[PDB]
Ligand binder design. Structure first.
Ligand SMILES: Nc1ncnc2c1ncn2[C@@H]1O[C@H](COP(=O)(O)OP(=O)(O)NP(=O)(O)O)[C@@H](O)[C@H]1O
Ligand SMILES: Nc1ncnc2c1ncn2[C@@H]1O[C@H](COP(=O)(O)OP(=O)(O)NP(=O)(O)O)[C@@H](O)[C@H]1O
Ligand SMILES: C[S@@+](CC[C@H](N)C(=O)[O-])C[C@H]1O[C@@H](n2cnc3c(N)ncnc32)[C@H](O)[C@@H]1O
Ligand SMILES: C[S@@+](CC[C@H](N)C(=O)[O-])C[C@H]1O[C@@H](n2cnc3c(N)ncnc32)[C@H](O)[C@@H]1O
Ligand code: MET
Ligand code: MET
Ligand SMILES: [K+]
Ligand SMILES: [K+]
Ligand SMILES: [K+]
Ligand SMILES: [K+]
Ligand SMILES: [Mg+2]
Ligand SMILES: [Mg+2]
Ligand SMILES: [Mg+2]
Ligand SMILES: [Mg+2]
Ligand SMILES: [Mg+2]
Ligand SMILES: [Mg+2]
Ligand SMILES: [Mg+2]
Ligand SMILES: [Mg+2]
Lengths: 383, 383, 383, 383
């Protein structure tokens, strides 16, 4: 059974991502000073400005302009030549405090009883398609924009600009990868180099080194800067907003999604924490060998600590009747707001780093670790 | 095989939705004056302001303050008492023009060859779970917030405020719905009514009349304004942004998603047009009885007119080998940028109405129509 | 020799003044925490927002939103009914730090040598026309708006709104006041009261009690809310900006002005400190009886500690040849940046109070005191 | 009787002036399309943005971004190197419409009866110190910044940046100029040139060619970029705002001022039109030889067509008893709102040009013309 699946990714220089980075850059700074802070930060980015707003209630004292300018600076925009400049852009702020009405339902007398930051559903996912138990398409797309950024920073291709996007579509037969049909790579550049040169250079430096030569055949079709010109990019060519990369932030469209963004919010926000916890059990279940691939899904109710719903989907690839596989889940992990935070130790400034190139796949992240696997195994035919 | 699935929806009074409405309110206005306009409008909403920005290149002449004020006004916020007021709020604008670099790849000499507005992937979906071939969870959640809004406007529950959100989780056994385990309904209100009364009133007026009495049992759990207090809402309690309701806008998490928002963009933007066209064939395939449920997926490359990928997933529920089912797709429909726009006649101001309560399910929308079904049938065992 | 002279004033509810208040409100808060802070705060106010920006370099930690909301709150706008609301309006911030390039010229190794914050000229003034040695027209105009504000707060005229402006023109014959020809008083109000009533009420409560009955004759002409309707006011009816009440802030147009605003800046800013010091010597000279009225004028050069120009003008009313009168000035006072601040002890949070109803005329202000007079007398025919 | 008087000016690259230019640039554009438009445009400018706001009620259709970007572009900021860039900066808009409440008092049935845009007082001035009957100090200071700008644009001193300010103080003995004591000239520059070179260059190219060599003696003191470094300037180093150059816009502090700004407002605004009409009669009086120097002052009441106050001050230099000189004023000119506009034909886009380097002194401006002089002479001892 043959079929085609497509995924995509964006460079750290992409408007939307710039936002996320900024958003999560502020939270980290804040958290460093106060772990129990409540941060709901939304960032808007355009031509010559950066808007950092939302609701933040913390005892910490931070500098938004500095965190912002520095964050963009690192991204790469440092001259009007590229369209945006950390040093000369505007930095606006419209940050209020979190509504007490919401807060009474979140932070209650007893810390354990403390409730979900909001209502909603989240999807977790894992697959044995790769070592990091992540789907392949998203993994390679991420690698593509990441490479472009590194070949830019190291000065290999000095004419590359921050803004860039990547798309790849794999060939799936017998349910496994047989190759790659089409490759898309768009990257901002200087008025100094020509399309052909650029195209030819992108192949050698960015695509050829990242895509497995086996999956590349005379069939594969390459799309490099199709409009034929990408000199204008960044916020000037496209408005950047927080939480608009929901899918590339997760599993590339392979798995499902509930609609909750990650960047800008502290862990008491189930959108981010319950999501991480979901990748945590899903991955751990597959590592435990209880299934080849499984999608998990939890849903919550604001101010309520106990999950409103949970469901594990193994697409038949399970090895123990879902029954015990589902009774095992709530048995081993605590999906209650104030259970996942301890479970993954989320009270730390570790999110900025998570704002570009996927929230999953980086084994050093607390939710990528698989310690519960072997124990999740004991609970079912150890041996 | 039993399992639980959860979906959610938001009222037209929800911050994020306010943005979308505004965003799509501007495009419509513009389009009315110029159908071939290029509108990429992003809106940011908070406590006392509304930020309309992005890139717009049109020959039309519109008034952002008026479209905005009027759009919010209709939503409901017209007094400081509710936290936001169309008449007294601030209306900011940061709207530039579309980058010529992008444009050269979109609008080419030959209109047919005209390319995709951007790279990316989109997911279409259909299911025989309901008459409108839409999943059930998203359909009832939408109905819940929609009811709340109507009971508010008609004056049945005058103490209701615009801001509201709804969550419902269904019981799925044997792959069909058996009932509903938990119901969540959060709505903003006045300082005049008490929780109990409120709760009791929400049940009679909003939940009881909308949820099928069959699926409601003594088991069902109801979560009404859990924090115990929701008097503060709207942009004051939560920052609103365009395109952050990606999932409730589509299929509630039942189907997949690529990451493209809808509101604020003209049809030359595949994020909205290829998405619509995808719901179109998926629905049309099920209506054609070629499958009980199928997910479609297309992906594009900026400046390129021909789709980079297409894939139909029928989850085995297909009735004709996928083979002919996939060769039929590209046979009957034109997924090229300037083929879907004619296919669905997208050059009209018909989007604002699509900004609240789902983009799918409203049979009067051009993509909800199923005319190609019977003909899609002829191409496979007519009879 | 008869002639007419007109002056005007504005309520604390006037858009421009709102800005000022806000601007100086931020400074005070900062200064309280750090007296040697460098504050250059500019505020922009419109329909539903408040923009606090400029350059601030301090070690203090303050909350702009709180200071702002509270400052507007106190002014009076607390409902959408009045057009603006401290609780529901937007608060934006674009505050960067002071340029080091300016700083090196201001704060030098030796504190005494420390230079002027900028180049410019300032005008001081004093007149025996009144006990507080202030001109009369500006004194009564201030009193008018101040009364309206007090009759509003105390609940005497509950239908009065914050926004209001006052204009008075005196009759000057033989160089002295003989009466008042025309009176102007514009005040915002509620949709509840009628013009006539309002007008009739404004006379009894605000004008009649404030203007000396002697100067009021059957000739005087009263202009009360001329357009016939002033229900819409505040930032909604008129954009408020910092430093746009330069004249009512000083002497009502009777004396001269160099163009430097007061609110929003710390004392190292000669626009404010040299100005104050100028009223100080001019007042002190008249109190010392060396002249009936004299205008002083100093000018500075950025980064330069020693004044670029000084000139005393006594309009012939002097009693000691200007010569010794000018040599006495630089003899008694220190107009060097770091001499006037000590001279008047300006490193304290005492400016917000100065943001409405005149910077001069309040004898409790450090620059209104006349201690040097008697000593300024000894230096010239004591007896 | 010796004494010192100081005045100052600012380049078209000064933040405040940038605002004014922008503000008056929008009006002209509008007016070009609709002369009877009502424009009250206030601009705020900082680091990477430009805020155009206020209240505008016109039938005209204009592009703020374009007018703005182009206006800044012409000023000179076109690279992040200089701190601001017309191409890459942000352009924001908060423009509402004029309050109808104000309007009913302005535009009434009979166009003649039409009322003053607001209340307030304005000062006109003329002096025989120079051919254009302007005071000397302000004339030379303007020339200084204007020269710097020209030596920058023509490429003479390519390392000069737009931002610059100038200060000059004249020696006045026997009531006439004897020379100049101190000269101040601050200009932004590139990291490429040194202070000494710069200073030495500024003297040859900007000061020496502009200041009369007669007035320059070994006594004169020159202050050139005192802080020792001015590389950072423009909105980055200092916040720009509309109407904050009230004094350099007029007479340099030699004459009086009422507090009304010029830029951003249409002629129905007495702040600008009554101001111009006042320079018109004052200049015309001196030209008519009725006095060596005279200050005029009018005051108005909103919605009221007939001036609330008028007074002419000739400082004894009059040649006809003030009496007939004052009865002549209201005899010859019409200071009613709808009389001055026809008097000077103000319904035209001629203001941008007036936003930098003084509103008076340019004999080609309608208010600089002296046609009524000879006729103002006939009315008093013709011969
Ligand atoms: N290093 C520097 N050396 C000399 N002049 C400078 C330097 N940096 C900035 N300036 C100038 O300082 C100007 C200050 O203008 P000014 O408008 O008078 O300041 P202000 O505090 O805003 N006061 P005002 O508008 O008069 O109330 C800036 O706009 C620059 O032209
Ligand atoms: N209907 C009305 N009747 C009378 N006064 C009004 C009315 N509407 C508004 N006003 C007042 O008009 C004021 C105008 O202030 P003003 O600041 O002098 O205007 P401006 O054009 O901004 N000029 P300025 O700052 O002096 O250059 C407003 O802020 C209100 O206090
Ligand atoms: C829970 S809020 C987002 C979290 C918030 N930004 C914070 O600071 O934690 C998201 C949505 O919940 C709803 N909401 C706001 N206040 C609420 C309350 N007290 N109880 C229930 N729902 C509420 C609104 O519709 C709002 O858009
Ligand atoms: C195609 S743009 C969005 C469409 C745009 N708002 C418009 O007005 O049509 C989205 C992303 O594509 C990339 N992009 C911008 N200009 C491009 C170009 N000329 N060629 C290819 N990709 C480009 C950027 O990374 C940008 O964030
Ligand atoms: C010498 S420019 C005017 C003052 C400037 N705002 C500052 O920060 O000091
Ligand atoms: C009398 S308020 C000052 C003028 C106001 N901006 C207007 O729109 O006319
Ligand atoms: K966008
Ligand atoms: K939010
Ligand atoms: K104004
Ligand atoms: K400033
Ligand atoms: Mg985006
Ligand atoms: Mg959510
Ligand atoms: Mg949201
Ligand atoms: Mg996309
Ligand atoms: Mg004003
Ligand atoms: Mg100044
Ligand atoms: Mg200034
Ligand atoms: Mg005024």
């Amino acid at each position: 059974a043959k079929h085609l699946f497509t995924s995509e990714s964006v460079s750290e220089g992409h408007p939307d991502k710039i936002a996320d980075q900024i958003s999560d850059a502020v939270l980290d700074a804040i958290l460093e000073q106060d772990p129990k802070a409540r941060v709901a930060c939304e960032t808007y980015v355009k031509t010559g400005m950066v808007l950092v707003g939302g609701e933040i209630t913390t005892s910490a004292w931070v500098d938004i302009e500095e965190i912002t300018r520095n964050t963009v600076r690192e991204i790469g925009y440092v001259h009007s030549d590229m369209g945006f400049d950390a040093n000369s852009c505007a930095v606006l702020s419209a940050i209020g405090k979190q509504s007490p009405d919401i807060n009474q339902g979140v932070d209650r007398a007893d810390p354990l009883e403390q409730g979900a930051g909001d209502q909603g559903l989240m999807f977790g996912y894992a697959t044995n398609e790769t070592d990091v138990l992540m789907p392949a398409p998203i993994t390679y797309a991420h690698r593509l924009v990441q490479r472009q950024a590194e070949v830019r920073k190291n000065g290999t291709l000095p004419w590359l600009r921050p803004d860039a996007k990547s798309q790849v579509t794999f060939q799936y037969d017998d349910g496994k990868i047989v190759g790659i049909d089409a490759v898309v790579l768009s990257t901002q550049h200087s008025e100094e180099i020509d399309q052909k040169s650029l195209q030819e250079a992108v192949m050698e430096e960015i695509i050829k080194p990242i895509l497995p030569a086996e999956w590349l055949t005379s069939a594969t079709k390459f799309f490099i800067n199709p409009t034929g010109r990408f000199v204008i990019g960044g916020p000037m060519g496209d408005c950047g907003l927080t939480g608009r990369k929901i899918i590339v932030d997760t599993y590339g469209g392979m798995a499902r999604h509930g609609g909750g963004a990650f960047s800008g919010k502290d862990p008491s926000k189930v959108d981010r924490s319950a999501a991480y916890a979901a990748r945590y059990v899903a991955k751990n279940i597959v590592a435990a060998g209880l299934a080849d691939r499984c999608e998990i899904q939890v849903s919550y109710a604001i101010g309520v600590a106990e999950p409103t719903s949970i469901m594990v989907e193994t697409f038949g690839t399970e090895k123990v009747p879902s029954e015990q596989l589902t009774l095992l889940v709530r048995e081993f992990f605590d999906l209650r707001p104030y259970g996942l935070i301890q479970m993954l130790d989320l009270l730390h400034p570790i999110y900025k780093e998570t704002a570009a190139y996927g929230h999953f796949g980086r084994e050093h992240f607390p939710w990528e670790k698989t310690d519960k696997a072997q124990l999740l195994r004991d609970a079912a035919g150890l041996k």
